[PDB]
Protein backbone atom coordinates (compact mmCIF):
# COMPACT_ATOMS: atom_id res chain seq x y z
CA UNK A 1 0.00 0.00 0.00
CA UNK A 2 1.39 3.36 -1.07
CA UNK A 3 0.68 6.44 1.06
CA UNK A 4 -1.41 4.57 3.62
CA UNK A 5 -1.02 4.15 7.36
CA UNK A 6 -0.62 1.39 9.94
CA UNK A 7 -3.86 -0.47 10.56
CA UNK A 8 -5.33 -0.43 14.04
CA UNK A 9 -5.48 -3.75 15.86
CA UNK A 10 -8.52 -5.72 14.66
CA UNK A 11 -9.36 -3.07 12.05
CA UNK A 12 -9.57 -5.59 9.20
CA UNK A 13 -10.24 -8.98 10.83
CA UNK A 14 -11.16 -10.50 7.45
CA UNK A 15 -7.69 -9.79 6.08
CA UNK A 16 -5.87 -12.91 4.92
CA UNK A 17 -2.25 -13.41 3.93
CA UNK A 18 -1.50 -15.91 1.19
CA UNK A 19 1.82 -17.44 2.16
CA UNK A 20 4.21 -19.50 0.05
CA UNK A 21 5.58 -22.58 1.83
CA UNK A 22 8.93 -22.73 0.05
CA UNK A 23 10.50 -20.39 -0.02
CA UNK A 24 8.55 -18.82 2.84
CA UNK A 25 7.31 -15.44 1.60
CA UNK A 26 4.22 -13.28 1.08
CA UNK A 27 2.31 -14.17 -2.09
CA UNK A 28 -0.81 -12.05 -1.95
CA UNK A 29 -3.65 -10.74 0.11
CA UNK A 30 -7.06 -12.35 0.36
CA UNK A 31 -10.18 -12.09 2.55
CA UNK A 32 -12.21 -14.30 4.87
CA UNK A 33 -15.86 -14.65 3.78
CA UNK A 34 -16.89 -17.56 6.03
CA UNK A 35 -15.29 -20.06 8.39
CA UNK A 36 -14.16 -22.21 5.42
CA UNK A 37 -13.88 -19.89 2.41
CA UNK A 38 -11.28 -17.32 1.38
CA UNK A 39 -11.62 -14.91 -1.56
CA UNK A 40 -8.68 -13.68 -3.63
CA UNK A 41 -7.58 -12.57 -7.12
CA UNK A 42 -7.14 -15.26 -9.76
CA UNK A 43 -3.77 -13.76 -10.75
CA UNK A 44 -2.48 -14.60 -7.27
CA UNK A 45 -2.75 -18.27 -8.20
CA UNK A 46 -2.54 -18.34 -12.00
CA UNK A 47 -0.56 -15.94 -14.15
CA UNK A 48 1.24 -17.67 -17.03
CA UNK A 49 3.12 -14.56 -18.25
CA UNK A 50 5.14 -14.77 -15.01
CA UNK A 51 5.20 -18.59 -14.86
CA UNK A 52 2.81 -18.58 -11.92
CA UNK A 53 0.57 -21.60 -11.38
CA UNK A 54 0.16 -22.51 -7.75
CA UNK A 55 -1.43 -25.70 -6.47
CA UNK A 56 -3.13 -26.16 -3.10
CA UNK A 57 -0.08 -27.80 -1.52
CA UNK A 58 2.18 -24.87 -2.40
CA UNK A 59 0.34 -22.43 -0.17
CA UNK A 60 -0.86 -21.56 3.31
CA UNK A 61 -3.34 -18.94 4.48
CA UNK A 62 -2.53 -16.86 7.56
CA UNK A 63 -5.52 -15.23 9.24
CA UNK A 64 -5.71 -12.72 12.09
CA UNK A 65 -2.37 -11.12 11.25
CA UNK A 66 -1.09 -7.61 11.86
CA UNK A 67 2.70 -7.82 11.65
CA UNK A 68 3.89 -8.73 8.14
CA UNK A 69 6.87 -10.88 9.06
CA UNK A 70 6.35 -12.09 12.65
CA UNK A 71 4.75 -15.36 13.65
CA UNK A 72 1.96 -13.93 15.79
CA UNK A 73 1.69 -16.67 18.36
CA UNK A 74 -1.72 -17.04 20.04
CA UNK A 75 -3.28 -14.55 17.58
CA UNK A 76 -2.87 -15.62 13.98
CA UNK A 77 -4.14 -18.94 12.69
CA UNK A 78 -2.61 -20.82 9.78
CA UNK A 79 -4.77 -22.94 7.48
CA UNK A 80 -4.06 -25.45 4.72
CA UNK A 81 -5.98 -25.38 1.44
CA UNK A 82 -8.41 -28.10 0.41
CA UNK A 83 -9.15 -26.72 -3.05
CA UNK A 84 -8.66 -23.69 -5.31
CA UNK A 85 -11.38 -22.54 -7.72
CA UNK A 86 -10.53 -20.01 -10.41
CA UNK A 87 -13.19 -18.28 -12.50
CA UNK A 88 -13.52 -20.26 -15.75
CA UNK A 89 -13.54 -17.03 -17.80
CA UNK A 90 -10.63 -15.36 -16.01
CA UNK A 91 -8.79 -13.47 -18.77
CA UNK A 92 -5.09 -13.47 -17.89
CA UNK A 93 -4.17 -12.98 -21.54
CA UNK A 94 -5.37 -9.40 -21.92
CA UNK A 95 -6.79 -7.34 -19.07
CA UNK A 96 -7.36 -9.62 -16.04
CA UNK A 97 -11.12 -9.65 -16.72
CA UNK A 98 -12.93 -11.65 -14.00
CA UNK A 99 -9.88 -11.67 -11.71
CA UNK A 100 -11.38 -13.80 -8.95
CA UNK A 101 -10.69 -17.07 -7.15
CA UNK A 102 -11.96 -18.95 -4.13
CA UNK A 103 -10.02 -21.15 -1.76
CA UNK A 104 -11.66 -23.70 0.53
CA UNK A 105 -9.87 -24.41 3.81
CA UNK A 106 -9.19 -27.96 4.98
CA UNK A 107 -10.76 -27.18 8.35
CA UNK A 108 -12.91 -24.29 9.63
CA UNK A 109 -11.07 -21.38 11.26
CA UNK A 110 -12.15 -20.26 14.74
CA UNK A 111 -13.38 -16.68 14.86
CA UNK A 112 -11.83 -14.34 17.45
CA UNK A 113 -11.27 -10.63 18.16
CA UNK A 114 -8.77 -10.74 15.27
CA UNK A 115 -10.52 -13.12 12.87
CA UNK A 116 -13.97 -12.41 11.47
CA UNK A 117 -15.60 -12.59 8.01
CA UNK A 118 -16.55 -9.65 5.78
CA UNK A 119 -19.96 -9.44 4.07
CA UNK A 120 -20.41 -9.87 0.32
CA UNK A 121 -22.72 -7.30 -1.28
CA UNK A 122 -26.24 -7.93 -2.50
CA UNK A 123 -27.53 -6.12 -5.60
CA UNK A 124 -29.06 -3.30 -3.55
CA UNK A 125 -26.02 -2.51 -1.41
CA UNK A 126 -23.86 -2.61 -4.56
CA UNK A 127 -26.17 -0.22 -6.40
CA UNK A 128 -26.25 2.11 -3.41
CA UNK A 129 -22.52 2.20 -2.70
CA UNK A 130 -20.68 1.72 -6.00
CA UNK A 131 -20.86 5.37 -7.01
CA UNK A 132 -18.17 7.77 -8.19
CA UNK A 133 -16.79 9.74 -5.26
CA UNK A 134 -17.82 7.21 -2.62
CA UNK A 135 -14.76 5.96 -0.74
CA UNK A 136 -13.72 2.44 0.11
CA UNK A 137 -10.78 1.04 2.02
CA UNK A 138 -7.90 -1.10 0.77
CA UNK A 139 -5.58 -3.07 3.03
CA UNK A 140 -2.46 -5.14 2.57
CA UNK A 141 1.17 -5.95 3.33
CA UNK A 142 2.39 -5.08 -0.16
CA UNK A 143 5.16 -2.70 -1.10
CA UNK A 144 5.13 0.89 0.14
CA UNK A 145 6.41 2.28 -3.18
CA UNK A 146 6.51 1.19 -6.82
CA UNK A 147 10.31 1.07 -6.72
CA UNK A 148 10.22 -0.59 0.94
CA UNK A 149 8.04 -3.07 2.82
CA UNK A 150 5.84 -2.47 5.90
CA UNK A 151 6.26 -3.75 9.44
CA UNK A 152 2.49 -4.06 9.85
CA UNK A 153 -0.73 -4.18 7.81
CA UNK A 154 -1.33 -0.96 5.87
CA UNK A 155 -4.63 0.77 5.14
CA UNK A 156 -5.71 3.49 2.70
CA UNK A 157 -9.10 5.03 1.89
CA UNK A 158 -9.72 5.79 -1.81
CA UNK A 159 -12.61 7.22 -3.84
CA UNK A 160 -14.34 5.29 -6.60
CA UNK A 161 -13.71 6.95 -9.98
CA UNK A 162 -16.16 7.71 -12.82
CA UNK A 163 -16.00 4.96 -15.46
CA UNK A 164 -15.10 7.29 -18.35
CA UNK A 165 -12.18 8.68 -16.34
CA UNK A 166 -11.03 5.11 -15.58
CA UNK A 167 -11.21 4.29 -19.28
CA UNK A 168 -9.42 7.46 -20.37
CA UNK A 169 -6.53 6.76 -17.95
CA UNK A 170 -5.25 3.67 -19.77
CA UNK A 171 -4.87 1.94 -23.12
CA UNK A 172 -6.06 -1.31 -21.49
CA UNK A 173 -9.63 -2.41 -22.27
CA UNK A 174 -11.77 -1.95 -19.15
CA UNK A 175 -14.81 -4.19 -18.58
CA UNK A 176 -17.99 -4.09 -16.48
CA UNK A 177 -16.28 -6.67 -14.21
CA UNK A 178 -13.87 -3.98 -12.97
CA UNK A 179 -14.06 -0.63 -11.29
CA UNK A 180 -11.26 1.83 -10.56
CA UNK A 181 -10.40 3.95 -7.53
CA UNK A 182 -7.89 6.55 -6.48
CA UNK A 183 -7.33 10.29 -6.37
CA UNK A 184 -6.98 12.43 -9.49
CA UNK A 185 -3.78 14.44 -10.01
CA UNK A 186 -5.63 17.66 -9.10
CA UNK A 187 -7.03 16.30 -5.82
CA UNK A 188 -3.84 16.61 -3.75
CA UNK A 189 -4.29 13.39 -1.78
CA UNK A 190 -2.90 10.10 -3.06
CA UNK A 191 -2.56 6.38 -2.38
CA UNK A 192 -2.85 3.05 -4.18
CA UNK A 193 -2.39 -0.68 -3.82
CA UNK A 194 0.94 -2.06 -4.98
CA UNK A 195 2.84 -5.30 -5.55
CA UNK A 196 1.90 -7.77 -2.82
CA UNK A 197 -1.53 -6.23 -2.16
CA UNK A 198 -3.05 -8.27 -5.00
CA UNK A 199 -6.09 -10.28 -3.97
CA UNK A 200 -6.82 -8.16 -0.88
CA UNK A 201 -10.17 -6.51 -0.24
CA UNK A 202 -11.66 -3.14 -1.20
CA UNK A 203 -14.31 -2.66 1.51
CA UNK A 204 -17.05 -0.13 2.23
CA UNK A 205 -19.02 0.42 5.43
CA UNK A 206 -22.73 0.48 4.69
CA UNK A 207 -24.39 3.52 6.26
CA UNK A 208 -27.68 1.59 6.14
CA UNK A 209 -26.75 -1.30 8.44
CA UNK A 210 -23.25 -0.40 9.68
CA UNK A 211 -21.68 -3.57 8.23
CA UNK A 212 -18.52 -3.83 6.14
CA UNK A 213 -18.96 -5.18 2.61
CA UNK A 214 -16.26 -6.32 0.22
CA UNK A 215 -17.03 -4.53 -3.05
CA UNK A 216 -13.72 -5.19 -4.80
CA UNK A 217 -10.57 -7.29 -5.02
CA UNK A 218 -7.17 -5.66 -5.59
CA UNK A 219 -6.49 -6.53 -9.22
CA UNK A 220 -4.21 -4.33 -11.33
CA UNK A 221 -2.62 -0.97 -11.94
CA UNK A 222 -0.02 0.52 -14.23
CA UNK A 223 2.73 0.94 -11.66
CA UNK A 224 1.73 2.03 -8.14
CA UNK A 225 0.30 5.42 -7.15
CA UNK A 226 1.22 7.07 -10.47
CA UNK A 227 -0.28 10.46 -11.28
CA UNK A 228 -3.12 10.00 -13.75
CA UNK A 229 -3.35 6.26 -13.16
CA UNK A 230 -5.87 4.40 -11.00
CA UNK A 231 -6.11 1.07 -9.23
CA UNK A 232 -8.46 -1.46 -10.79
CA UNK A 233 -10.56 -3.78 -8.66
CA UNK A 234 -12.58 -6.89 -9.45
CA UNK A 235 -16.29 -6.07 -9.23
CA UNK A 236 -17.34 -8.58 -6.57
CA UNK A 237 -21.09 -8.20 -6.97
CA UNK A 238 -20.94 -8.70 -10.75
CA UNK A 239 -19.28 -12.07 -10.11
CA UNK A 240 -21.37 -13.10 -7.10
CA UNK A 241 -23.41 -15.63 -9.10
CA UNK A 242 -20.19 -17.57 -9.71
CA UNK A 243 -19.14 -17.27 -6.07
CA UNK A 244 -22.49 -18.69 -4.96
CA UNK A 245 -22.36 -21.47 -7.57
CA UNK A 246 -18.97 -22.58 -6.28
CA UNK A 247 -19.92 -22.45 -2.60
CA UNK A 248 -23.25 -24.20 -3.24
CA UNK A 249 -21.59 -26.95 -5.29
CA UNK A 250 -18.46 -27.61 -3.24
CA UNK A 251 -19.48 -26.36 0.20
CA UNK B 1 12.75 -11.65 6.39
CA UNK B 2 9.90 -13.84 7.65
CA UNK B 3 9.98 -15.49 11.07
CA UNK B 4 9.84 -19.29 10.82
CA UNK B 5 6.37 -20.73 11.35
CA UNK B 6 5.70 -23.83 13.46
CA UNK B 7 6.71 -27.01 11.59
CA UNK B 8 3.29 -28.65 11.83
CA UNK B 9 1.97 -26.20 9.24
CA UNK B 10 4.54 -27.32 6.69
CA UNK B 11 3.78 -31.03 7.09
CA UNK C 1 -22.68 -15.34 8.27
CA UNK C 2 -25.47 -13.41 9.99
CA UNK C 3 -22.66 -11.69 11.89
CA UNK C 4 -20.57 -10.80 8.84
CA UNK C 5 -18.88 -7.41 8.61
CA UNK C 6 -19.23 -6.46 12.28
CA UNK C 7 -15.77 -6.23 13.82
CA UNK C 8 -15.31 -7.56 17.37
CA UNK C 9 -13.07 -4.66 18.39
CA UNK C 10 -15.15 -1.96 16.71
CA UNK C 11 -18.82 -2.35 15.71
CA UNK C 12 -19.41 -5.05 18.32
CA UNK C 13 -18.27 -2.64 21.07
CA UNK C 14 -19.62 0.53 19.42
CA UNK C 15 -16.07 1.85 18.95
CA UNK C 16 -15.08 3.63 15.74
CA UNK C 17 -11.76 3.34 13.97
CA UNK C 18 -9.73 6.45 13.18
CA UNK C 19 -10.76 6.95 9.55
CA UNK C 20 -14.14 5.29 8.99
CA UNK C 21 -15.76 8.72 9.27
CA UNK C 22 -13.95 9.68 6.04
CA UNK C 23 -15.88 6.92 4.27
CA UNK C 24 -19.22 7.91 5.77
CA UNK C 25 -18.68 11.55 4.75
CA UNK C 26 -18.16 10.48 1.12
CA UNK C 27 -21.53 8.67 0.99
CA UNK C 28 -23.46 11.77 -0.07
C1 LIG D 1 -3.06 -5.62 -16.52
C2 LIG D 1 -1.73 -5.94 -15.84
C3 LIG D 1 -0.85 -6.77 -16.78
C4 LIG D 1 -1.02 -4.67 -15.38
C5 LIG D 1 0.09 -4.93 -14.37
N6 LIG D 1 0.86 -3.71 -14.18
S7 LIG D 1 2.37 -3.76 -13.63
O8 LIG D 1 2.56 -2.69 -12.68
O9 LIG D 1 2.63 -5.02 -12.99
C10 LIG D 1 3.45 -3.57 -14.89
C11 LIG D 1 3.38 -2.16 -15.43
C12 LIG D 1 4.14 -1.16 -14.84
C13 LIG D 1 4.08 0.15 -15.32
C14 LIG D 1 3.24 0.45 -16.39
C15 LIG D 1 2.47 -0.55 -16.98
C16 LIG D 1 2.54 -1.85 -16.49
C17 LIG D 1 -0.48 -5.41 -13.07
O18 LIG D 1 -1.01 -4.62 -12.30
N19 LIG D 1 -0.39 -6.71 -12.80
C20 LIG D 1 0.23 -7.75 -13.63
C21 LIG D 1 -0.07 -9.04 -12.88
C22 LIG D 1 -0.36 -8.63 -11.45
C23 LIG D 1 -0.93 -7.22 -11.54
C24 LIG D 1 -0.52 -6.43 -10.34
O25 LIG D 1 0.65 -6.08 -10.19
N26 LIG D 1 -1.47 -6.13 -9.45
C27 LIG D 1 -1.21 -5.40 -8.22
C28 LIG D 1 -1.72 -3.98 -8.24
C29 LIG D 1 -3.07 -3.73 -8.01
C30 LIG D 1 -3.54 -2.42 -8.01
CL31 LIG D 1 -5.26 -2.13 -7.70
C32 LIG D 1 -2.68 -1.35 -8.24
C33 LIG D 1 -1.34 -1.61 -8.49
C34 LIG D 1 -0.86 -2.91 -8.49
C35 LIG D 1 0.61 -3.13 -8.76
N36 LIG D 1 0.86 -2.93 -10.18
C1 LIG E 1 -1.77 -24.94 -14.37
O2 LIG E 1 -1.75 -26.03 -13.49
C3 LIG E 1 -2.73 -27.11 -13.86
C4 LIG E 1 -2.48 -28.25 -13.01
O5 LIG E 1 -1.15 -28.63 -12.82
C6 LIG E 1 -2.57 -27.50 -15.29
O7 LIG E 1 -3.43 -28.58 -15.64
C8 LIG E 1 -2.75 -26.37 -16.15
O9 LIG E 1 -2.66 -26.77 -17.52
C10 LIG E 1 -1.73 -25.35 -15.84
N11 LIG E 1 -1.84 -24.18 -16.72
C12 LIG E 1 -3.04 -23.32 -16.85
C13 LIG E 1 -4.28 -23.57 -16.08
O14 LIG E 1 -3.00 -22.38 -17.62
NA1 LIG F 1 -8.51 4.41 -22.90
NA1 LIG G 1 -2.85 7.53 -9.33
C-alpha–C-alpha distance, residues A209 and C11, integer Å: 11
- Is B5 within 8 Å of A71 when comparing Cβ atoms? yes
Q: How many CA atoms lie within 13 A of A74 on its CB side?
A: 0
Active site residue A99: yes
Q: Which ligand is nearest to the CA of A233?
A: 1
Backbone angles phi, psi at A217, to 5 degrees: -125, 130
SS3 B1: coil
Which residues of B are less than 8 Å from A149 in CB distance? 1
Say how many domains are in chain C.
1
Q: Which ligand is nearest to the CA of A165?
A: 3
- Is C28 within 8 Å of A13 when comparing Cβ atoms? no
Domains A1-12+118-237 and A13-117+238-251 fall in the same CATH topology? yes
Instruction: Identify from A78, A148, A149 which residue to disrupt to test chain B contact, counting B C-beta atoms within 10 A and taking the largest count.
Output: A78
According to the entry, how was the structure determined? X-ray
Q: What DSSP string describes chain A?
A: -BS-EEPPTTS-TTEEEEEETTTTEEEEEEEE-SSSEEEE-GGGTEEGGGTEE--GGGEEEEES--BSSS--TTT-EEEEEEEEEE-TT-BTTTT-BT--EEEEESSPPPPBTTB-PPBPPPHHHHHHH--TT-EEEEEES--SS-----SB-EEEEEEB--HHHHHHT-SSPP-TTEEEE---GGGS---B--TT-TT-EEEEE-TTT--EEEEEEEEE-SSSS-TT--EEEEETGGGHHHHHHHHHHH-
Ligand 1 in contact with A28 (CB < 6 A)?
no
Domain ranges of chain A: 1-12+118-237, 13-117+238-251
Q: What are the respective helix, strand and coil percentages of chain C, to the nearest 5?
A: 35, 0, 65
Would an 8 Å CB–CB cutoff place A80 in contact with chain B?
yes
Fold assignment, A13-117+238-251 = Thrombin, subunit H (2.40.10)
Range of C1's domain? 1-28
Would an 8 Å CB–CB cutoff place C23 in contact with chain A?
yes
Which residue's CA lies nearest to atom 6 of ligand 1? A222
- Output the CATH code of domain A1-12+118-237: 2.40.10.10
Q: Closest by alpha carbon to A106, among A40, A170, A37, A54?
A: A37
| Resolution to one decimal, Å | 1.5
Output the domain CATH number for residue C28: 4.10.140.10
Amino acid sequence: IVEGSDAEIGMSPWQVMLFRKSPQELLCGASLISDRWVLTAAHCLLYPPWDKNFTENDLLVRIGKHSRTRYERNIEKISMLEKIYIHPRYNWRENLDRDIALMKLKKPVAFSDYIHPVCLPDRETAASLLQAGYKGRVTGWGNLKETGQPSVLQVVNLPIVERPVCKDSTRIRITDNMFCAGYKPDEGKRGDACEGDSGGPFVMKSPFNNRWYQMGIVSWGEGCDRDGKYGFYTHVFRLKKWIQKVIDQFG
Amino acid sequence: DFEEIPEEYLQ
Amino acid sequence: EADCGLRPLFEKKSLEDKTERELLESYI
